[PDB]
Design an enzyme around this catalytic site. Sequence first.
Site, PDB file in Angstrom:
ATOM      1  N   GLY A  50      44.096   0.361 -18.969  1.00  0.00           N
ATOM      2  CA  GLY A  50      42.691   0.086 -18.769  1.00  0.00           C
ATOM      3  C   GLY A  50      42.432  -1.297 -18.218  1.00  0.00           C
ATOM      4  N   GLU A  87      35.299   4.407 -20.889  1.00  0.00           N
ATOM      5  CA  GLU A  87      36.044   5.042 -19.802  1.00  0.00           C
ATOM      6  C   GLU A  87      37.309   4.255 -19.463  1.00  0.00           C
ATOM      7  OE1 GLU A  87      35.838   7.838 -18.296  1.00  0.00           O
ATOM      8  OE2 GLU A  87      33.829   8.641 -18.649  1.00  0.00           O
ATOM      9  N   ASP A  88      38.132   4.021 -20.487  1.00  0.00           N
ATOM     10  CA  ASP A  88      39.428   3.365 -20.337  1.00  0.00           C
ATOM     11  C   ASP A  88      39.291   1.908 -19.919  1.00  0.00           C
ATOM     12  OD1 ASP A  88      40.675   5.926 -20.830  1.00  0.00           O
ATOM     13  OD2 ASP A  88      40.298   6.402 -18.720  1.00  0.00           O
ATOM     14  N   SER A  89      38.181   1.271 -20.262  1.00  0.00           N
ATOM     15  CA  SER A  89      38.008  -0.153 -20.034  1.00  0.00           C
ATOM     16  C   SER A  89      38.290  -0.913 -21.325  1.00  0.00           C
ATOM     17  CB  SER A  89      36.601  -0.445 -19.519  1.00  0.00           C
ATOM     18  OG  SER A  89      36.450  -1.820 -19.237  1.00  0.00           O
ATOM     19  N   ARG A 141      43.528  12.056 -25.287  1.00  0.00           N
ATOM     20  CA  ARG A 141      44.892  11.690 -24.924  1.00  0.00           C
ATOM     21  C   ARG A 141      45.876  12.000 -26.044  1.00  0.00           C
ATOM     22  NH1 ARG A 141      42.761   7.585 -21.610  1.00  0.00           N
ATOM     23  NH2 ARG A 141      41.322   8.774 -20.284  1.00  0.00           N
TER      24      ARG A 141
END
Lengths: 384, 64, 1136, 48, 205, 114, 79
Positions: C905, C766-768, C937
């Site tokens: 992130g 999740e964009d980490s 994306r």
Amino acid sequence: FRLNLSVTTPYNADFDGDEMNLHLPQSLETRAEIQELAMVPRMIVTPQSNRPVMGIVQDTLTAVRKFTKRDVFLERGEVMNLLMFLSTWDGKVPQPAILKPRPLWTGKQIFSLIIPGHINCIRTHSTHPDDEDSGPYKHISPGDTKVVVENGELIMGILCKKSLGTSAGSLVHISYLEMGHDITRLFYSNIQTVINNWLLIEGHTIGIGDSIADSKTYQDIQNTIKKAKQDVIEVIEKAHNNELEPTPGNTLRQTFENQVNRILNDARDKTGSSAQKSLSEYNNFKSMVVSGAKGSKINISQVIAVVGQQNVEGKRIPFGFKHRTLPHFIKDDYGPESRGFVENSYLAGLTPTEFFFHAMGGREGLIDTAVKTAETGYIQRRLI
Amino acid sequence: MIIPVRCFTCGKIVGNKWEAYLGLLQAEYTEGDALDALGLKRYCCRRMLLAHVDLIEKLLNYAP
Amino acid sequence: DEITPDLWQEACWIVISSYFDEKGLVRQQLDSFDEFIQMSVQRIVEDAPPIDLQAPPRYLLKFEQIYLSKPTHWERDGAPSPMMPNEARLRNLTYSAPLYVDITKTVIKEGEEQLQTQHQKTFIGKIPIMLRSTYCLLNGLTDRDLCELNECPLDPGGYFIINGSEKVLIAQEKMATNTVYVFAKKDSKYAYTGECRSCLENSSRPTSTIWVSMLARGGQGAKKSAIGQRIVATLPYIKQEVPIIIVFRALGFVSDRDILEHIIYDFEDPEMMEMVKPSLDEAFVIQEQNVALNFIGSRGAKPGVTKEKRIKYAKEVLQKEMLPHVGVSDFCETKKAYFLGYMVHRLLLAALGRRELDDRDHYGNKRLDLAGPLLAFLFRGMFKNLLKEVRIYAQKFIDRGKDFNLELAIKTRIISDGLKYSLATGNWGDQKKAHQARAGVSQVLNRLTFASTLSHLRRLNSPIGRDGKLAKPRQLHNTLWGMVCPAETPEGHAVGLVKNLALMAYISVGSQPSPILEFLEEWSMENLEEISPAAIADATKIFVNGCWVGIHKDPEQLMNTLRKLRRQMDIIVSEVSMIRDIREREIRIYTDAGRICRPLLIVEKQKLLLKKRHIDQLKEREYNNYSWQDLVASGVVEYIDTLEEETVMLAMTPDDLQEKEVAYCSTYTHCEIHPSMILGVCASIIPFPDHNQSPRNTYQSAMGKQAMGVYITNFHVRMDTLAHVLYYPQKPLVTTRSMEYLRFRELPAGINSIVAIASYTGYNQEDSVIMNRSAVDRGFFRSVFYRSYKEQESKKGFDQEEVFEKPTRETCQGMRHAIYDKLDDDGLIAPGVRVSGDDVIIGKTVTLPTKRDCSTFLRTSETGIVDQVMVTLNQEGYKFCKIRVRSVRIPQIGDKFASRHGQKGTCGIQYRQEDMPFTCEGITPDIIINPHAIPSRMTIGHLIECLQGKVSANKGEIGDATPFNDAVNVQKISNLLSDYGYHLRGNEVLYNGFTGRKITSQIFIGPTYYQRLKHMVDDKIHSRARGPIQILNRQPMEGRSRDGGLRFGEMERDCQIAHGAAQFLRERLFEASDPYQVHVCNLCGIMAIANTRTHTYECRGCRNKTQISLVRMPYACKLLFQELMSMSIAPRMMSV
Amino acid sequence: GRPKLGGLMDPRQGVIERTGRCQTCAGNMTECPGHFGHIELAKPVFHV
Amino acid sequence: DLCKGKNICEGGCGRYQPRIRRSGLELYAEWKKILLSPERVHEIFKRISDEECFVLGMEPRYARPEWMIVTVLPVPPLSVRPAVVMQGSARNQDDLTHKLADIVKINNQLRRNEQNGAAAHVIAEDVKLLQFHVATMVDNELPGLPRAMQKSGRPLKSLKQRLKGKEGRVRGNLMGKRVDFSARTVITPDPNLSIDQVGVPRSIA
Amino acid sequence: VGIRFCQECNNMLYPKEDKENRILLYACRNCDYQQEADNSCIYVNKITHEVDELTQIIADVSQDPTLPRTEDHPCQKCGHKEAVFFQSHSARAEDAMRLYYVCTAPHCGHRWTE
Amino acid sequence: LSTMIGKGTGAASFDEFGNSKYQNRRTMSSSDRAMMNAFKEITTMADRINLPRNIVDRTNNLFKQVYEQKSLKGRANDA
Ligand SMILES: [Mg+2]
Ligand SMILES: [Zn+2]
Ligand SMILES: [Zn+2]
Ligand SMILES: [Zn+2]
Ligand SMILES: [Zn+2]
Ligand SMILES: [Zn+2]
């Protein structure tokens, strides 16, 4: 603040800078209220749509799809590692699916230990063919696309978003309806910990190689676009020569736009499907789409085949200049390129006009996002 | 600002190679040849010198 | 000879290099300011009427010439000295230049004797100076000289220093003036409305707008429906709409034939004739000019007592208030009749459908107000005030019979403070009239990144208010091509409203149309006052700056001659727009400021006028004197504004569009120098931006403004409130051609990182992002946070003063639980001292009317080391101290990181080198991003940059990621990578770091440029547990820096109602916010007086003190009921 | 330099200063709920 | 709705009822046309019977028509209009306190004029100002009327402005408010936590 | 359909009938002037208003560099091969996709529709 | 402390014949009005010879004491 990945969906939260607020109840009476009413496990199934509000997402969802494939076999050492991450494990190692020539456990076997209780569920994989249910192999699926959990054991089928996501009838939904919130709570945690640690072996990436297609696929995409160009040219000639009869209920301008948009939409669909067929089983773009973790078939087609028509307010790019979209086109140019049809993929790259028209289309989404936040917020307040 | 002492990725010492790297470029070496001459084989270390910006030279222009 | 396609790519970037070697990137700011100082200020002084005093002796004052000296600072002892910009920043001075004017004083004493005296160089105030402008001290200083002044040579200037604050005037976007625009309002009572915002030459008394509207057909009637739609005019200073034919009568045109000759140029057209018939009938009653003038005067701004006053007032409005740009004299009635008829003619064409309605979003119909026009607008008001008080002061002395001292008449505060205040606060206009003052024009220059600094100096502000919502102004209009970056725009309420100039876009500074008008008269152009109206039909109207000057019978020859002159720079300057609307038979010439233009290569006969000789001459740009301006002089490249672009047939590239091929366009007029110039500063650093989804490009443009790096080379001398410096900035391995001109190599804002796109342990989901702990231990993305605290000791009052000293707990009244031991004897902490939260860095004591404590407490979260302690005198002459605290920020979990493709992130976890996955060579990724960030994306440019970065690092060459470059393909990059012993698609076999086993899937890994974002978790983490409360509501304070509480808003409240958690809802909204107790009378629900000390509770009003009930309610509810009581409402709380 | 009865900061109305006390109820800033004064208008006016 | 149709008094004193017209803060009675003073409306309302008031939908014990005429103006407590300390020991008074100064000055000036027996037109101008200051003490967003500024161009925040809006007293301080025992920080993933767990920094704990 | 102004004061002439002669007349309001009517049609209202766009076209459009040029539609008058074509783009038509051609030869502004 | 009436917006704000009915009135005390004018004069002189604001503040304080002490009441305020 550190969160489980499953609660990201109900919170609509991400980890790209989102901040969340913590409230500490200050008395037992309010502490008991939260404990008995507002704890996450009690929130698993929402009354809004009588279905789970959180499911398996991202890595675990992409990996569990790979894990439950028919041909996933685990060695004795690998299995014992996974059972270390199964909090509900009874401590008994199941008999391996294959005993000779070597003891091998299948992924479904290990997932069966994760499944709580003895729930029974029937689902289909995202790639389940429609005619297989009517074929001679209805109950022995050639593709392993029929999901059957019987007596708490996954006897067949590949698990995906359809059987593990936030949909009614999901295996996660059954666990809540059958086992309750506490056992379902352990279900979500056990899926993540077990398959996250197996993903350390199998791995999952995405790179340039997944964005490429066979030269045969590129020719098919190029031919489809080239044919679409001629089809739009032919319609333009008909309109120019007054050979275009308006469709009933539409003006001549509306009829021409409908024909052009229909031609270009079909070309985008045909090119998109052509790109999807070329993808191999190892393709990582397809891996995250079949599992339902991220992306769609449209994303794959745009990355590989063609970005497609750029629209502003539901119409092709308007004549912002005098009878033309940009100073690089002649006047009254109704061809696909002039009005914002991107014939390139993201991998190929956009031409300067396509890049600008694509920027025009993207701006519409950004405006909507800013508008949608406030337009819907007022509606929510008034309803409450 | 100044050449990092170690490569960020593997920890190889690169802070004694900036002046040598500049000298090699002065000797008509190509950047790839100069990096090879300095023994930076892993592209992580080549990244260190190939992408370094020596701003400390500009900072020394300002009087203390 | 001719540039072959094999050499075009080098040739075109030699052209672009010479443009930026000359123009730079803040040319629009500096050129606009230079024009304001050089021309506007002198013009405003010259245009001012001479001051005449008569009360007998007669005194005349004339302001002849303007002088401006270097930015000067005066010490408290009165000694002037040149003010360096760095001194202004440190001592919080305003970078201003003294302004002097020559004034001639002639007195007539009625004795037939005239005495004339000139007061040479009279000080009239101080003008803030834009840095690196022609009147700045840094002007004409070599880079070596700038360093000696502690100034960064890369600093572009273009901003003001007001009270030490770097201030940038944002270009204000407005609709073009003097141009007729016809719009249709669906809801309004008018079917169509043709407006013209007319302004005087040189931007005199503000713009006057005239609307010519056609009434809608909605009204139903036997007479209304039969006649049709009538045209009315909305003149300024008139309450009510005036029928159009009356206005023509008031001008001096009575007969219907005469009026129609100014509206309809071809009587043979019957459709247009029928359109004006309903208007003729409306004004049939008025058949005389004087009657028409009286009618308009009747609606005047003030009622007319007598008819003579009404007629005089009506003539006054028409003479000057109506269409002032056409003329402001008494003989301009014929000129205004023609233009007003053109407005009616334009309205008729729109109603008849013969001409398309004008587009408000078109940038041909837009102007950008830069610092010059902005400053000139202020200076006209201030100079009028200066003369107003000069007249008032001199009137008092001349009345008394004594002569007046001219110097004592001048109030220098009027211009000095008026200019300073507008730039200081951004409220545009007057402080007294801030209600109508435009806000946000002046902003503190952003110094987060050098790219952010450049972007802020090229920002464009749309007229539409941010609060208001409307998609159309926020949309990316077609006409922004090459003028405005299509990607750079903020996300949120300002989407599409705040814009950035394209890289090569230039904003016209403006010039006088006199040379063009004189040439037109010399050329075979018939004047408008000499022709008959019948001749207008065949001829083409000639407009210069929106004023219809005449007609021409040979438009094609005239346009060729005009184009030839501009290309030769003979009579027409480069920034002059010549637009021929062939269909409309109009030639529009524009010379005013605010027009956005870009340079384009001229094409003649499908051939670029740019040949190999020009490229060769440019190649030796130095030691040859050949520059960009020689290309403009040579006539091979010319500037094109948005209006002129409509008439331009433009080739994207010469190599393909000019060459013989399938016949698409054989008549090309211009060519792009490079298509990559449609991007602005921030979008120009995105590698392969044409491989990303467009919203990702917009997101990076925002993220790049927040990337740490080295914002300026002289950051050590500067003492900014906040400043982030990266330990080891790197230039990107994969760069763009445009990056050479942004100075991104000189001031990079990122590091090249070995990035693996893999699902490793779930800590990058999740964009980490997973970061390499060992890499961070080696300085990877280490940054410094600099925070400056400024404190001033000021004595103001009869016996009240503030001083710097160590406040003793006994001597001083106010005190806090912080530590005051670090302070030195002079009340200032020393450099090199470690300071944590709740530490006192400045010991300030204000004498009590013993003494209160106003000491500065270090930010609670902040834990740094005192870097610098500067003490000086501020602009007010008071002792001034700035303290810089240095804190080193090692990347933590929760710190934001982004690639150059919108993939931001936070760091989810940091693994050591042994824990990270490794290749067979022992390479571990510095960063691991989740594969799930890519598919939705569609940031394919991220994957290409990683692949190209791998080739660049192995090959030893900085990769080229310029967007529209056919010479670079993924297949080409993949083939290059194979030559270095790597998988051609950038995948590698990685081994699990925990077990050492090969990962079944091969991982895409390679160098990618990432950037550490300003947003660090330690600056955002905030905890509240019974903090201080605010005075008005007695609720938790607001803000992290104030230890405030988090808001439990209506949405949070609505959520807890659905939960059914009534008690928790009561905790949040009552117990945890503002628990309060009141005593309420039982008979009347009003709050009673309670004296707990005496145990006496009384209700004044009921004469009872025995039955009073204690009610537990929020303090805000008490405040509400008391506030309601202030409005005579009686909220009576009844307990029964 | 001190609050005056019949003024805008009448001490009988509140203790808005931290180190103070209300004459009406002898409460501090936190304890005192505030008290209403009034203005006797010379002529009646409409309530908007 | 029923009384609007009527135009004559029927009862006693059969007379033509004027058509009341409002121009800003002033009421005009047209039959010819006179300025309907608040004291005139006060006298009319004072004579309405309690039973008649009930018919008009007004409980006499809780709302009399005459009470809607401002005879005595309530002065909010100090806590309602507290002075805020900033930049030294110089109190900055509240907008309500600033407005009360105008009201106290004009009514004081109005009282002196009546005692001094000033001209009727002079008193009428004073009454106009008193009506404006009293009106803008409660509502400073009066339509088509001048705003009360803060001597610097910033309009005064009246009582009405304080209560309405998202940031008003009701929505901003009662329906929602800032709370103690709350924490905020960035969120990062933790696959090793349960779905019902939250990892919390030690500094917040 | 035509518009006339009185020769006396050059104001709009409006139709009027004379009962004695029963012949249409055009009379000026502010002038009392009268004129014999020859058109006999007070006005014509064209709801469809199928105005020939060729009249509205300007021959100078051939000088526009942004208009497309075709050599497949020779001028009917002079036979010049090159011609420039475009669409009406005129409102109130309710439908417009046909092309209008203009001869590119100078001094021959011939215009036609295929 | 006082509030100034703003500019009228609608027709209700303006009298029967143009001029606004709500007009600002001067409640400024004569002593304060004179003192305000002296401070304006003090700043005007200081700007002529570029004196720092701290000297102006000292001058303003000096004038207030002299103005209140009233020994120089016979002399012009500008002096
Ligand atoms: Mg987010
Ligand atoms: Zn290395
Ligand atoms: Zn009571
Ligand atoms: Zn009290
Ligand atoms: Zn006549
Ligand atoms: Zn011809």
